[PDB]
Design a binder for this molecule. Structure first.
Ligand SMILES: *[C@@H]1O[C@H](CO)[C@@H](O)[C@H](O)[C@H]1NC(C)=O
Lengths: 49, 39
């Protein structure tokens, strides 16, 4: 309770494991990443599919 | 960022001394003298 101000969309929620707010979830889903190799990818690159 | 050879992972948390990768740092700590890796 903050005097009637509603900060529920900007404060995080512990339901999801990556504790991001609603607006942060929209901003992260909106930008489509190029899926670079910042995660290891050579096991994917070995299996030709 | 790959895998580390020569440093033992611990379940602690300090400030970052030598940055390795996605949230992992390494340091030279007394607890015999050895190199440890931590988040
Ligand atoms: C505004 O606050 C109420 C609690 O008084 C909450 O139930 C509601 O979900 C909030 N609005 C939004 C859009 O989350």
């Amino acid at each position: 309770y903050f005097g009637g101000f509603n900060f529920s969309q900007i404060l995080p929620d512990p339901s999801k494991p990556s504790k991001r707010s609603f607006i942060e979830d929209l901003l992260f889903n909106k930008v489509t990443l190029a899926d670079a190799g910042f995660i290891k990818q050579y096991g994917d690159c070995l299996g030709d599919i | 960022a790959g895998c580390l050879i020569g440093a033992e992972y611990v379940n602690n948390s300090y400030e970052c001394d030598i940055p390795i990768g996605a949230g992992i740092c390494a340091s030279y700590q007394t607890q015999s003298q050895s190199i440890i890796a931590y988040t």
